[PDB]
Amino acid sequence: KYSIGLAIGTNSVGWAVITDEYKVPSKKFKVLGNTDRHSIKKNLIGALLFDSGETAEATRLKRTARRRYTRRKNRICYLQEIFSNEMAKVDDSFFHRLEESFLVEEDKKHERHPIFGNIVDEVAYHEKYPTIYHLRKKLVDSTDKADLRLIYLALAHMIKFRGHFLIEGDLNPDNSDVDKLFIQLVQTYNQLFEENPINASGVDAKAILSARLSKSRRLENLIAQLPGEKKNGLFGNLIALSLGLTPNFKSNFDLAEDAKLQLSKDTYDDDLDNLLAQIGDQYADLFLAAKNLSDAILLSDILRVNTEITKAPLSASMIKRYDEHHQDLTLLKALVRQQLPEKYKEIFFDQSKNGYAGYIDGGASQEEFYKFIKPILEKMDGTEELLVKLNREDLLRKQRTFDNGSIPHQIHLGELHAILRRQEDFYPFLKDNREKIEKILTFRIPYYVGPLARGNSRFAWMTRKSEETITPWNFEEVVDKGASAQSFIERMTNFDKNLPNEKVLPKHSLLYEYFTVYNELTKVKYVTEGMRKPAFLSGEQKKAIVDLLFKTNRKVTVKQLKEDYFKKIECFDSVEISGVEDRFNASLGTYHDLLKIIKDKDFLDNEENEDILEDIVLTLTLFEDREMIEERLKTYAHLFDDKVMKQLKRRRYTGWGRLSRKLINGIRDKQSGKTILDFLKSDGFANRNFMQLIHDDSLTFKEDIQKAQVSGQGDSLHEHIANLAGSPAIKKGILQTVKVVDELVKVMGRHKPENIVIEMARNSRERMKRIEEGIKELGSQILKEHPVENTQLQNEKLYLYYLQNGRDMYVDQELDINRLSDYDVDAIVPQSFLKDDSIDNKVLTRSDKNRGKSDNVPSEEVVKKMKNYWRQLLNAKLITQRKFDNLTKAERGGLSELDKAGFIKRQLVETRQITKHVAQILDSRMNTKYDENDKLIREVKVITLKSKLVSDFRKDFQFYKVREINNYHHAHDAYLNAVVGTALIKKYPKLESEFVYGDGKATAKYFFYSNIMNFFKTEIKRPLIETNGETGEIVWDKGRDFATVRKVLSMPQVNIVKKTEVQTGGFSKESILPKRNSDKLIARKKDWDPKKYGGFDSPTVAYSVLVVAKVEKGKSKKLKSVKELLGITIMERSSFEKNPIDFLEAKGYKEVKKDLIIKLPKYSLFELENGRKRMLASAGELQKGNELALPSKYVNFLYLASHYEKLKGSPEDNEQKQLFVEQHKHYLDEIIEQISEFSKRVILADANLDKVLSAYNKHRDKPIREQAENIIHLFTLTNLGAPAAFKYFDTTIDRKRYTSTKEVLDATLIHQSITGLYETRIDLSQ
RNA sequence: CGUGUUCUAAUUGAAGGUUUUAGAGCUAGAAAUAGCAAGUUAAAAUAAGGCUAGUCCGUUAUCAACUUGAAAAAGUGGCACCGAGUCGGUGCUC
DNA sequence: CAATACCTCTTCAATTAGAACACGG
DNA sequence: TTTAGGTATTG
Known part of the structure; x- marks a missing residue:
């Protein structure tokens, strides 16, 4: 006789229970425990709060990290295992000192000095080769045998920190002189293209190309020197290409399909080559000439140093940084001495203040120290060059700084290679292991390979050819690499909704294509002059149509049918076709795609080869990497010409379907012995449809399916609540609310409710990049003219101005940066129709009166002036398809009276699908009873509401919600949602399809919805008491009921239950504190004394536990009795549960009372004294x-x-x-x-x-x-x-x-319910 | 069907940061002190650590209590009424 | 004791997959 | 992106 309304939010969940007159019931409960009380009376409404649920994104970037950090440790491992024999010969403990390099001299086992043991020599090395980049030049240059332990020393360093794989290729650093290289391109392109000849013109190609200026610009700066060549003309792209780019010369050679080229991209050498053959082999020389330049420029940024002396430029650059510190370190200190020597301690000796002494020795970034001395450098005079260097950002460089990592790995490997070549003569073992050693630097598992697990990873999926251990060297052979790649993907792709078991077919499969075609053709009607009734296309006719028209054209059109088949074959001078639009919707695209590739039409037609074409596409869809693609294209390799195969690889396919293969032809109807495809081709008489067939009782198709949905019988509740597409936090709530219902029902004597009413309610740097890019494509200097910062754009009227690029969206005029205030934000689509605050639906212009009518989308007048302008923005990505399409809409007709009706509805009916399963799950859990007909006995109504019913209702009825006062309101919000949704569908059963879960003209519809909530009011002149005119049922009483609401709302006591949750997560603040005399500090590793070595701190505590126990005080070690709280940290927790007492004793508590211990999760509640109440938060605080x-x-x-x-x-x-x-x-x-x-x-x-x-x-x-x-x-x-x-x-x-x-x-300990109703109360005296 | 954004799940990389150690500090001066020279680099751990010993796993989700289960999760607490500062009383069942 | 006051690892690359949601045709 | 438990500091 009651109804339950609930509110489901991110952090909160609001529930309520309602009488038959919208009262809220008031029950007297039991109370287990030792306290005097045996019952307490509480109301039937409330809220359960909790901590917001957390996504796995941080944890994964942890998951990733740990897999990542150890591998790097492994690379440093393989060098030693290569080296062990020859290093013991040379030095017994070199490797041992390195492993123990960290330990304190006292705890040090070997000689303290890592490199040579001796104090004297180590000093010597550090002062000929002071930075490891001074050593890295030597052993790429020197032709004199060097101490092996220095060689390994070089090698690990590159491997430990190696460079990015963004660019993959090989680099010959014979490219130091750009001008020479470029000029050589001018030459070969002239020879190729005698008719139009370039002139080199003495461009400082090194100078032009070398410069930091943005990549697009340089190619412009280069073509500004040329005498009259187009930017996108053949030369321009080439130039653009060497500088990393993906130009396109498809337009100069008019290839049918676009031909796009990146040197960096993996698919280049063939890609040009696959392309190159197609333009003649002659050019091929031209591109290589281009690459050779690319290599010289490409590395240009790392070193501008003359190439000619050095075969190891990158490292040589670092030597450069060191020298450019030194003299600027003498000259600064010298200059400070010359002027203002008095303030010289602050700058150098004192760490704290951002001084150089800070810079080297304190926590002072490169940006933190450059803006400290900015006044000082300026304040000082005679430092002018110095100032210039800093402004360049070159002032006092350090060898490790955030930027490096635009260092590709291929010079770090360029330099590993030089050393081995240099010294393999001295040491035989290098030539034996040069390949291994290079392979350590070279090798990265691909993504699709995944973790190299052996059956113990929830995460990994790879599969193994050989079970021997995997080493970078043996990799291809051990891992079933291709098969593993197909495993990567076949776990993240779908299963048929109809058939759970069968994995979905790829989109471009022919069979989906013969399915789509044969399905869209099934309902073609045709008529001619003679016939009594227009009639279905016959089986003979459909097959004839598919075979002739479809197999001959990408797209089949209506008058193609009329004249091509009917006149040509059936000879109807004229015909009428009922079925179709201008052209058939589907096409046999894949069939066509292939015909071009292999050119054997009968082959495609032949049935026997049909499983190849799906295992061609399932393999072409399935794979990204062209080398990878090849492998399974060998299996069918024998038949095709070699020339096709090369062609075959290129047209990769994307996307996946929703239909399986046993559906389309998988299953056979028993009586009729035909599969759907069979059915689709040749259903005699009436041509049944896929949908139809799947519901033809006469057919077995629905019946057979029936088993499929059933199998596995669903899954247990969280197994399901954790697969719904949504917020992690929202799902946590969804669960919690059901745990509420099953109590509320449990509470109401296991009596099921009449109604269950559910509600749900509804970047800093992101803004910076989008503008960054957008101007670049636009190419406007507006960003240059005025610059702005990343913290600034949480203010739209600023932020909007930039996307609009400082022009009026509706007006075609520039904008005032400063007085944004005068201007107005305008929402493209009026708020009344829809509530949008998004950058998608906002605009900023001076006056919001220039768009057009208040009551419509921006006016035709507005679109005309600036429809074009709106294109630059879309291409820039300064706006979006949503933003664009609405903006241009008016020419689509302004929103129709149909459109408006639609927006007013959606304010009120929840169409949010996340809020649907939640609705559905309740119905399913709630209603299990089954009637004699297959029909369902719905005994609990479920209801989904939009927030705007309740949120507005308070506004119009003096029920205002102040969030801030109390946490109560989240609980009132079920009540209102309870009576709103109950009383609604007691007046309009008609709407039950829309408001409740289970199975032009618009203008009126607009009216029907807008005024729907009127009846509550007395004047808008309405009668006080409402009723269902159909049932003669009372739904409302304006006077009695309104008073009741107020009575419910202001109730003093509501149930408010912070969920007790055990803490989880990282053990302590990640930061590593310096060695301190504290027992607070946590030892980072089991041997490393934090007093000695430093440690963590600040461990979080998964749950505390009260020990009532004794400890010894004083020399006597007398045993007193204590009762305190001991929080158990999350490192500790695993340890605790194995045995508490042994664990507890270890802490030193003596004669612990075993029974007494009580686990206390964070957020536990005690009520002491006055009724003052407190929630535990940490072991030491409440x-x-x-x-x-x-x-x-x-x-x-x-x-x-x-x-x-x-x-x-x-x-x-x-x-x-x-x-x-x-x-x-x-x-x-x-x-x-x-x-x-x-x-x-x-x-x-x-x-x-x-x-x-x-x-x-x-x-x-x-x-x-x-x-x-x-x-x-x-x-x-x-x-x-x-x-x-x-x-x-x-x-x-x-x-x-x-x-x-x-x-x-x-004091009292209260263990409450998931609702607060059932308690058990614990008086803690003992 | 096409497209586009947004958010979630997985995998594989790079660059910094931090932490002890190694880069013979000197000149005085009995000393705290005070004169100047030096600084840019490397090694290593980077959740403690687990057994299933992998180039694997280690920060998500789930969690009142009590009887019971390995865990999942099942089972436990009268009703009415008048009233309201976090539930107080009444009558009834019991 | 319990009043004040500081601290809290970061920022980049590349690849797949799928809801959910909102424009067009 | 800011909370809200851990830390040692000062009166």
């Missing part, structure tokens, strides 16, 4: 446990007082509210008295409270809007949970935390 049941009038009063966004109300009413603000303006004192009395009673943090009071007291003069909003601010001290910062108008009130758990220890 949280505000109390809620404020503010009498409503104060709740109502404030909402108006804050006066949010001024007033949105209808004008006459606004007068009505105001007097009451100041009739009851004295209420403000009442509120403070309400906080003031309560704060004294429960919050119990007086030291602050006087402080708070005073702020209000001296601000009595200030207006209510000011004072009024702020009092709302002041609620923050009050609120359930943990202290945070807050202020009155300018006065900031710091928090007061609760610093020990002692006061809990002889």
Whole structure:
């Protein structure tokens, strides 16, 4: 006789229970435990809060990291295992010192000095070769045998930090001189293209190409010197290509299909080559000439140093940085001595202040130290060159800085190679292992290979040819690499909804194509002059149509049918076709795709070869990497010409279908012995449809399927709640709410509800890049003209201006950067139709009156001027298809009366699909009973509501919601949603299809919805009491019921249950604190004394536990008795559970009482004394446990007082509210008295409270809007949970935390329900 | 069907940061002190660590209590009424 | 004791897959 | 992107 309404949010879940007259019931419960009480009475409405659920994204980037860090450790491992024999010969302990290089001299086992043991020599190496990049030049240059331990020393370093694989190819650093290389291209292109000849013109190609200027520009700067060549003309692309780019010369050679080329991209050498043959072999020389330049320029940025001396440029550059520090370090210090020597300690000796002494020795970034000395360099004179260097960002470089990593790995490998070649003569073992050693630097598992697991990884999927250990060297052979690649993908791709078991067919499969075609053809009607009835296409006719027309054309069209087949074959001079649009919707595209590739039409037609064409496409869809693609294209390799095969690889396919293969031809109807495809071709008489067939009872197809949906019988609840497409947090809530219902029903005597009413409610650097790119494609200097910062664009009217590129969207005029305030944000589509605050639906222009009518999308006039302008933006990606299409819409017709009706509806019916399964799951769990007909006995209605019913209802009925006062409102919001949705479908059963779950003309529809919520009101002239005119049933009573709502709303006691959740996650703050004398510090590794070595700190605690036990005090070690809290940290927790006592004793607690220990999750609740209540938060601290049941009038009063966004109300009413603000303006004192009395009673943090009071007291003069909003601010001290910062108008009130758990220890412990209804109460004295 | 954004799940890379150690500091001066020279680099751990010993796994999800289960998860607590500062009383069942 | 006041690893690359949602045709 | 438990500091 009751109904349950619930609110499901990210962090909260609101529930309620309602009588037959919208009252809320009031039951007396039991209370297990030792306390005197044996029952308590509580209301039937409330909210269960919790911590927001957390996504796996951080954890995965952890998962990734750990797999990542160790592999790098492994590379440093293979060098040693290569080296071990020859290193012991040379040195016994070199490797041992390195492993133990970290340990303290006292704990050091071998000689402290890693490289040579001796103190004297190590000093020597460090001063001939002071930075490891001084050593890296030597052994790529020197032709004199060198100490092996220096050689390994070089090698690991490159391997440990190796360079990025963004670019894959081979680099011959014979490319140092760009001018020479470029000039050589001018030559070979002239020879190729005698008719139009370039002139080199003495461009500082090295100078032009070399420069930092943006990549697109340089090719422009180069073509600005040429005497009159087009940018996109053949030369231009080539030039553009060497600089990393993906130009296109398809337009100069008019290839039918676009021919796009990146040197960097893996698919280049063939790609040009696959292309190159097609333009003649002659050019091929031209591109290589281009690559050779690319190599010389490509590396240009890492070193501008003359190539000619050095075969190891990148490292040589670092030597350069070192020298350019030294003399600028002498000259700075020297200059400071020359002027302002007095302030010289701060700059160098003192770490703290960002001084150079800070820079080397303190936590001072390169950007933190460059902006410290900026005044000083300026303030000083004679430093002018110095200033120039800094502005360049070159002032005092360090060898490791954030940027490196635009160093490709192929010079780090360019330099590994030079060393081995250099010294393999001295040492035979290198030539034996040069390949291995290079392969260590070279080798990266691909993504599709996955973790090299052996059956123990939830994550990995690869499969093994040989079970021997995998080493970079043996890799291809051990891993079933291709097969593994098909495994990568076949776990993230779909299964048929109809058939769970069969994995979905790829999109470009011929069979889907013979299915789509034969299906769209099944309902073609045709008529001619002679016939009585227009009739279906016959089986003979369809096959004839598919074979002739479709197999001959990509697209088959209506008059292709009329004249090509009927006239040609059936000779109907003229015909009428009912079935189709201008052309058939499907096409036999894949059939056509192939015909071009292999040119054997009968082959495609032949049935026997048909499983090849699906295992061609399943392999062509399935794979990304062209080398990978080849492997399974060998299996069918024998038949085709070699020339085709090369062609075959290129046309890769994408996307996947929804239909399987046993469906389309998989299953056979028993009586008729035909599969759907069979059915589709040749259903005699009526031509049944896929949909039809799947519901033809006469047919077995529905029946057979029936088993398929059933198999596995669904899955248990979280197994299902964790597969719904949505927020991780939202799913957590979805679960929690059902755990509420099964109680609320359990509570209501296991009596199922009449109605269950559900609601759900609804980047800093992202803005920077999108603009960054957009201007670049646009090429405007507007970004240059005015620059801005990454922290600035959370303000739209600023941010919008940039996407619009400083021009009026509706006006074609430039914009005032400074006075954005005068201008107006305009939402393209009016808010009344839809509520959109997105960058997608907003625009900024001076006046929002130039778009057009208030009541429509921007006017035809607006589109005409700037439709074109809107294209530059879309291409720039400065706007979007959603943003664009609406903007251009008016030429599509402005929103039709049909459109408007649609928006007004969607405000009220929830079409959000995440809120659907949730609705569905309730129905399924709730209604299990089955009637004699297959039909379902729906005994609980489910209802989904949009927020706007309830949110508006408070606005129009004096039920205002102030979130800030209390956590209560999340619970009122079920109640309202309960009675709203119950009373709705008691007046309009017709809407039950829309509002409840289970199976032009618009203008009126607009009316029907807009006024739907009228009936509650007395005047809009409505009768007080509502009814169903059909059933003679009462639904509403304006007088009695409204009063009831107020009675429910202001109820003093609501159930508010912070979920007790055990803490999880990282053990402690990731930061590694320096060695300290603290027992707080945690030893980073099991041997490493943090007093000695440094450690972590700040461990989080998965749950605390009360030990009532004894410890010894004093020399006597007398055993006293304690009862304290011991938090068990998350490193510790695993250890605890194996045995607590042994673990507990270890801490030193003695004669621990085994039975007494009680696990306490974070957020546990104790009520001590006055009814002041507290939630555990950490072992040492507790949280505000109390809620404020503010009498409503104060709740109502404030909402108006804050006066949010001024007033949105209808004008006459606004007068009505105001007097009451100041009739009851004295209420403000009442509120403070309400906080003031309560704060004294429960919050119990007086030291602050006087402080708070005073702020209000001296601000009595200030207006209510000011004072009024702020009092709302002041609620923050009050609120359930943990202290945070807050202020009155300018006065900031710091928090007061609760610093020990002692006061809990002889107090009540409350273990409540998932609802707060059932409790068990524990008086802690013992 | 086409397209596009957004968000989620997985995999495979790069660059910094941090932490002890190694880069013979000197000149005075009994000393705290005070004069100047030096600084740019490397090694190593990078969740403690687990057994299934992999170039594997190690921060998501799920969690009142009590009886019971390995775990999953099943089982446990009268009703009415009048009233309201976090549930208080009444009558009834019991 | 419990009042104040500081601290909290970061920023980039590449590849697949699928909902969900909103424009067009 | 800011909270809200851990840390040692000062009165």
